[PDB]
Design a protein around this nucleic acid. Sequence first.
DNA 1: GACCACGGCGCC
DNA 2: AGGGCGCCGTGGTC
Length: 539
Amino acid sequence: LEEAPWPPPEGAFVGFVLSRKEPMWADLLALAAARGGRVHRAPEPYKALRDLKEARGLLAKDLSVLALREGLGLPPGDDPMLLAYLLDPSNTTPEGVARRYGGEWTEEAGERAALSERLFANLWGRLEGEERLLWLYREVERPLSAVLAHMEATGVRLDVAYLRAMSLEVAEEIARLEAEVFRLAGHPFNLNSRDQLERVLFDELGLPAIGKTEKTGKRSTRAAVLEALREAHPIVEKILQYRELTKLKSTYIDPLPDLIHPRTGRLHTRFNQTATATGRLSSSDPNLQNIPVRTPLGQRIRRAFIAEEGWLLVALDYSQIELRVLAHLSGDENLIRVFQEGRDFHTETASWMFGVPREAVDPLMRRAAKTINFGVLYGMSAHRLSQELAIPYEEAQAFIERYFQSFPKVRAWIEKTLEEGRRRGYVETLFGRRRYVPDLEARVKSVREAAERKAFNMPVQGTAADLMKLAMVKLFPRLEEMGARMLLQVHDELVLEAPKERAEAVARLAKEVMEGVYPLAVPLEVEVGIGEDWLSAKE
DNA sequence: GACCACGGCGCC
DNA sequence: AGGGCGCCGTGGTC
Ligand SMILES: Nc1ccn([C@H]2CC[C@@H](COP(=O)(O)OP(=O)(O)OP(=O)(O)O)O2)c(=O)n1
Ligand SMILES: [Mg+2]
Ligand SMILES: [Mg+2]
Ligand SMILES: [Mg+2]
Ligand SMILES: [Mg+2]
Ligand SMILES: [Mg+2]
């Protein structure tokens, strides 16, 4: 390319180099642009950022985030990564995408700009005639990138003092548990080491080993194994409690307070748009899609996610979302009839599990029923079902049998989906998002069957993901107009922040947008709460 | 200081 | 031998 002075003309493709992967934390080391057979390198990258009207190119959203951090409105546009990800969601990295579609991902901005341009040309060619994938690009993924950039740059407020205090408290309880474990083992060892614990439990204390690990075939110490040994030796209960607390402390209580950004005073995640096989988003650095919620100890951590002063959080969660999608995709008249009748499958299963009326089911019980319902749907074994329900193996089988006999069109939809996957090499969502699943004709049964479970899950999880994305795209402009913010997405949930004076209206509107995004054969239902913190906003 | 593989486990 | 993720500490290694 011809070297030309900065700035580039409008419409140019950008290349950029960051000091680290997180745009909210990165130094912008270099910036360049390419168009029309020319490359333009910025003498000073931060100054030069002001000259761009759009971020067009590889990882455009990341540059947009850094621009927003600096007070600039630089929306992301075309990004070859999104085209590639739609063609095949195994396309998750710029290294891999460049090699597959025509170049090399280097560490120089001018080269990255030129690469972006040529990758765009080639990948745009590949999507010609792929009308459904093009619709996803234009109506979902490209506009969504701008939404994600605003979410990332906005961040969420954290009660740091509350978590710092919690660390001190949890440490004392951890020490009580470890001391007891070491007393019972008769010696000290590294309780965080699963290899050392294995030896202590199964060789020294002579407890029965129940299961093996996946890759290395050691005797497992996982919670399901420990649960089955709780009455076999008092050490087991202590270990379970120790793991609960150390998990909370090491993963959430200690790390999160140290990640407050010095300028925003908030915590900033990354919402990765080309990271999953199904079309879901993921969140990283830190992951805010797995903040604890199940146990009362984990719940305390959610209290730390708070609204700005004078604002409230608004939490919206699609009800029974994948079950509704399955009713639409399969066309099962009976499953559709459940949602037309306003019933709740999770509550119904919980009533059975715990042996109480529907009205006696509490939130803890209902949540427990979710793993069972989704587990069974996507191929859980009778053995495992019998294990985490503490019931005979026989009535676990029968429960699985009763499940599929109630909704006949589901088995048929599974069989069609799998034959299509074998024939075409991919399965697809309602909107035509694809996942290639090559091991569907593997001759090793366990491998083949695992591939089948991946394959028929994807249209369901992926259609739910497509719906949530479309809802975000539609909702975002409306929030902006009301002076509200979108903070987090957690797969089938959104967390917004609204001024107190507007929070009730924002909740009503966001519910409506989410319910009406793309009607199915069954209504979509959304539960919405408002509160000072994330725990209170979901109650 | 890092990379990776693993087991383990937090959420959806 | 439920599906999708990312992060922990350990262990091995460079
Ligand atoms: N153990 C789980 C939990 C969740 N999911 C997937 C399927 C539903 C989706 C969203 O999770 P939830 O909101 O917790 O499930 P829900 O059915 O929408 O329940 P709720 O009515 O409480 O929102 O995630 C899953 O595959 N396995
Ligand atoms: Mg407040
Ligand atoms: Mg839900
Ligand atoms: Mg949810
Ligand atoms: Mg390091
Ligand atoms: Mg490596």
